Amino acid sequence: MQRVDEMYRLVDSTGTGEDRDWGNQTLLGRLLSQAQTVSIGKK
Amino acid sequence: YEAMRSEMLPALAEDSEEIEFTLLDDVNDYLWNGDAKLKVDTAVWGGLKAD
Amino acid sequence: MQRVDEMYRLVDSTGTGEDRDWGNQTLLGRLLSQAQTVSIGKKVIESRRYSEAGRINRSMSGQTDIDMDKTKSSYQKMVIPVFDGAYGRDFRDYEAMRSEMLPALAEDSEEIEFTLLDDVNDYLWNGDAKLKVDTAVWGGLKADASVAAYSLGADLTTATEAQVVAELLALLDVLRITNKKSGPFELYISPQIMSNWQKLAGANTNGFMNIMAAVRALIPEFSVVEADSALQGNQVLCSVVGTRGLHAKIGMMMSSYQVPRVMHNDPYQFVKWFAAGFQSNNSFSGLKSTVYGS
């Protein structure tokens, strides 16, 4: 690692993600928490 | 992926938490805008601002 | 298990394939036994070559302001490609041939692995210009810019005893004089020359172990003097092997596996693959280390 021509860069590998919105999925977060579960195939 | 396993850089882990956000985003585009292309007999949805 | 019109016949299994060659993989058998193993995915292996240093000063009293130095650096790069090969039969055939317990796999996984290395042996001498990452081509042991080219004057297939040693030292002095290299060398001959160097000059003038007469008696620097079928005709090659000279780095060692069968009529298939790369060492000062004769 770190070719001695450079050797001066502490390159980090964390990522620091990507933020959400403030009010992105507030309605859908309430519907999918009170939802009834049916079987697949029932269209 | 065998190269990025050597440097211990997580790259599939930064995709499980980036599709699951996008998958719950286009089920959010179906709530607020609907889709007319999914109709069985008369059960369209149309969207929360055109139904 | 036999007819009655074929009881005199005694067809025996465990046959033979083909005998390889005279000196087939002698050089590659030495490189891949001293090779360093790196991880897969590393396509370019840049290595460092520092310089020499130091200013000294003599004195009688000894206190004359001792003076310091350090070393510079530069890099030289190689490349690691991947080789692969496969083989396979159908479903109705292999169930017919298996009822007599014929070792048909061992007469195929030894005759595909052999021609797998026989394409690596082609990449060593006539390496393809199709695998280049940034500037790390290989080019081959007879066309590279990292290999010293030296033209022979006298044909080594028809010359006498005296013109051989007079034109073998002129090859070795492109490593001791104009390229400053030292250490244990070795020498690789084409078989048409070695059929001449034993035709005369050996079994006609005193004999005495002409292979080893320039190994530990007269020339201790020539460690191994063997033939190689990749050189054909009037061509030789002298170089250093080891980490300071011609060396090889293995990406993934030679492994094999079977493609699994899903249905009942899936054909049998097996895959062998391999990955390694070659480079001849240059110094920091630009001193080459391999000579290819004509």
Method: cryo-EM
Q: Å resolution of this model?
A: 3.6
Q: Is C134 on the interface with A (CB under 8 A)?
A: no
Output the DSSP codes for C69-101.
------EEE----EEEEEEEE-HHHHHHHGGGT
Distance CA(C156)–CA(B22), nearest Å, equals 73
Structure tokens at C64: 């004359």
DSSP letter assigned to residue B40: S
Tell me whether B20 touches chain A (CB under 8 Å): no
- What residues of chain B lie within 8 A of the CB of C39, using their CB? 2, 6
SS3 C6: coil
C190 neighbors C236 (Cβ within 8 angstroms): yes
Chain C residue with Cα closest to B3: C41
Distance between CA atoms of residues C261 and C89, nearest Å? 13
Does B23 lie at the interface with A, CB-CB under 8 angstroms?
no
C171: alpha, beta or left? (left if phi > 0; alpha if psi -120 to 50):
alpha
Which residue from B minimizes the CA distance to C44?
A: B3
Residue C46, classed as helix, strand or coil, is strand
The rounded distance, in Å, linking the Cα atoms of C193 and C208 is 19
What are chain C's partners, defined as 3 or more CB pairs within 8 angstroms?
Answer: A, B
Cα–Cα–Cα angle for C167, C168, C169, rounded to 5 degrees: 95
Residue C115 DSSP code? H
Q: Which helix (H) or strand (E) holds C240?
A: strand C236-240
Q: In the structure encoding, which two tokens stand for residue C96, read together?
A: 């017919």
Rg (CA), chain C: 26
Structure letter (DSSP) for residue A40: T
Q: Residue C235: count other Cβ atoms within 10 Å of its Cβ.
A: 19
Residues of C in contact with A3 (CB under 8 A): 46, 75
